[PDB]
Amino acid sequence: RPVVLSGPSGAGKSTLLKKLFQEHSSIFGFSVSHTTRNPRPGEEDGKDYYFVTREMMQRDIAAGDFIEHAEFSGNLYGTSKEAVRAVQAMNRICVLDVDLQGVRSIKKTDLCPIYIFVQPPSLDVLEQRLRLRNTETEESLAKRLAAARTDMESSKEPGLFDLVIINDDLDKAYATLKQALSEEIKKAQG
Ligand SMILES: Nc1ncnc2c1ncn2[C@@H]1O[C@H](COP(=O)(O)OP(=O)(O)O)[C@@H](O)[C@H]1O
Ligand SMILES: Nc1nc2c(ncn2[C@@H]2O[C@H](COP(=O)(O)O)[C@@H](O)[C@H]2O)c(=O)[nH]1
Numbered sequence: 243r244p245v246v247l248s249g250p251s252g253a254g255k256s257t258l259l260k261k262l263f264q265e266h267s268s269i270f271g272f273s274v275s276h277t278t279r280n281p282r283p284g285e286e287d288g289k290d291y292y293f294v295t296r297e298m299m300q301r302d303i304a305a306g307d308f309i310e311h312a313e314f315s316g317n318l319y320g321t322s323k324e325a326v327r328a329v330q331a332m333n334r335i336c337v338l339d340v341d342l343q344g345v346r347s348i349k350k351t352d353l354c355p356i357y358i359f360v361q362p363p364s365l366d367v368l369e370q371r372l373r374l375r376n377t378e379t380e381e382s383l384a385k386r387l388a389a390a391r392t393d394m395e396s397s398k399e400p401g402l403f404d405l406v407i408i409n410d411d412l413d414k415a416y417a418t419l420k421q422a423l424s425e426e427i428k429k430a431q432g
């Protein structure tokens with residue numbers, strides 16, 4: 243059963259997932275999404291995302307290559323069918339990191355995952371960590387924080403998410419994440 247992690251920008255998803263993959267790369271495979279945004283230092287094409295142009299993406303979207311796509315804070319993102327098929331082909335549990343539109347779209351597909359919402363202690367803390375990571379422009383930060391307020395609604399929409407994890411203390415959040423996935427982990431014999 244695949245895993246979908248969602249939550250506001252700055253919540254701690256990449257951080258939690260980096261910990262999950264370093265401990266369980268034998269069991270999990272990451273879905274590499276396509277995006278039009280520019281790489282951040284340390285990000286790697288084909289690893290964090292497939293960094294492409296809006297033009298190609300729109301072309302591939304129309305060609306039917308994507309499971310879902312969404313505009314987020316000025317940029318286009320999407321889960322191509324191939325990024326998920328590749329993981330499943332290697333017999334690994336596919337893990338996706340997407341926004342709320344992505345979650346709503348995936349609910350209408352046959353991926354059938356467990357949905358987890360990563361929530362910051364509060365918006366103030368979220369803003370402080372996001373600003374500190376210092377990877378977004380002020381305009382980008384404004385859009386992300388606006389989206390965060392708006393989307394935090396969802397962690398509560400009845401039946402939407404299977405679980406909500408508060409990323410206050412990181413070790414604690416990570417233990418919570420692994421417990422949620424303990425079955426998949428144990429079954430895979432990891
Ligand atoms: N529990 C935590 N406490 C303090 N800082 C954290 C914690 N978890 C992550 N961070 C830091 O907060 C920033 C946002 O986390 P990140 O995982 O990149 O969020 P996301 O991928 O959800 O946008 C990063 O600089 C990260 O190192
Ligand atoms: N719907 C959707 N959202 C995505 C996808 N890839 C990344 N995102 C999301 O878009 C936001 C911005 O991610 P970032 O620019 O910080 O890497 C996050 O909420 C993230 O989950 C994707 O393929 N589909």
Ligand SMILES: [K+]
Pocket residue numbers: 273274275338339340
């Ligand atoms: K992603």
